[PDB]
Amino acid sequence: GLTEEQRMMIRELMDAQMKTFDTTFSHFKNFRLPGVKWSQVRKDLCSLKVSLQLRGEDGSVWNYKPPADSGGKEIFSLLPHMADMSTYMFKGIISFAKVISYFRDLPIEDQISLLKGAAFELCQLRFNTVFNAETGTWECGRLSYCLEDTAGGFQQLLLEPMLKFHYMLKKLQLHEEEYVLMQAISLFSPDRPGVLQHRVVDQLQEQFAITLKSYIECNRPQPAHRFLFLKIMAMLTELRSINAQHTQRLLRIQDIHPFATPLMQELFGITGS
Numbered sequence: 001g002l003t004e005e006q007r008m009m010i011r012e013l014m015d016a017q018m019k020t021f022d023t024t025f026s027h028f029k030n031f032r033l034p035g036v037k038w039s040q041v042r043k044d045l046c047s048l049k050v051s052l053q054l055r056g057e058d059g060s061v062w063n064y065k066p067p068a069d070s071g072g073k074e075i076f077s078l079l080p081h082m083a084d085m086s087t088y089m090f091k092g093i094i095s096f097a098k099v100i101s102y103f104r105d106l107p108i109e110d111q112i113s114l115l116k117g118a119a120f121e122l123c124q125l126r127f128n129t130v131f132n133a134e135t136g137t138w139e140c141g142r143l144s145y146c147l148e149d150t151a152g153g154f155q156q157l158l159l160e161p162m163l164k165f166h167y168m169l170k171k172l173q174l175h176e177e178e179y180v181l182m183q184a185i186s187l188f189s190p191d192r193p194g195v196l197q198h199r200v201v202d203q204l205q206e207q208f209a210i211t212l213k214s215y216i217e218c219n220r221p222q223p224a225h226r227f228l229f230l231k232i233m234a235m236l237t238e239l240r241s242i243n244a245q246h247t248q249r250l251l252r253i254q255d256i257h258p259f260a261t262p263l264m265q266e267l268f269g270i271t272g273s
């Protein structure tokens with residue numbers, strides 16, 4: 001059974017989620033779109049291929065198909081747009097954290113250290129709820145990002161850590177409550193660089209984890225859900241690892257071809273000097 005403290009915990013989390021997660025992306029607009037040595041490393045984009053579809057509120061449909069690597073620039077045509085999508089998502093994530101009392105009560109410095117450390121992770125957790133594993137497309141309201149099929153299909157795509165992460169998590173068929181608790185556990189990570197009240201954060205995280213484990217125990221008796229709590233924690237550990245690698249990937253691209261917005265710069269620690 002769920003204690004009163006646990007029920008209020010989930011409620012506050014769900015309330016924060018509904019108030020700050022624009023699931024239809026209706027407020028995402030004015031975004032940029034692709035025009036009408038260290039480079040070899042920059043080839044990180046390779047493991048990425050997504051077409052973009054924009055459905056007009058009038059019935060019209062714009063569809064974009066990316067180019068192929070053949071020289072230079074070309075592979076950076078989608079960065080501005082993605083930087084804008086990232087920024088929109090980050091704003092929603094920052095808002096999520098701020099409305100939560102457990103977060104508001106932490107020192108302003110720790111709130112920042114926690115947000116810079118978990119923003120990417122929280123964004124992926126939200127993106128997974130709009131991911132369609134049948135069609136391999138993230139349905140963001142009137143925008144859709146579909147994976148461009150190639151060489152070997154599904155098995156070939158799961159080789160990309162982030163993609164395998166999205167399919168695996170989606171396969172667990174989690175409830176809204178379990179997703180928001182995953183966001184909390186990720187947000188309240190006592191082991192982020194720059195955290196002072198690591199003692200309080202650690203205890204808060206354990207409470208969220210305990211609440212999740214109990215939620216699962218109380219509402220998922222099916223044999224298919226055995227070890228679900230542990231599977232979820234392993235996924236969060238994996239997401240943290242994916243976070244570190246993608247940050248390094250982003251910084252390398254940023255160094256050669258700047259695109260990070262001011263908010264992204266803030267979150268990634270870029271000073272502007």
Ligand SMILES: CC(C)=CCC[C@]1(C)[C@H](CC=C(C)C)C[C@]2(CC=C(C)C)C(=O)C(CC=C(C)C)=C(O)[C@@]1(C(=O)C(C)C)C2=O
Binds near residue numbers: 044045049162163
């Ligand atoms: C449908 C989704 C998840 C859109 C936001 C995409 C990103 C904007 C961009 C997509 C890449 C291309 C080539 C179009 C890749 C990049 C890395 C940065 C590069 C410069 C290559 C990243 O690692 C991930 C990880 C997730 C994937 C599903 C591949 C993000 O979600 C981004 C992100 O910031 C999130 C956390 C909001 C990122 O910044």
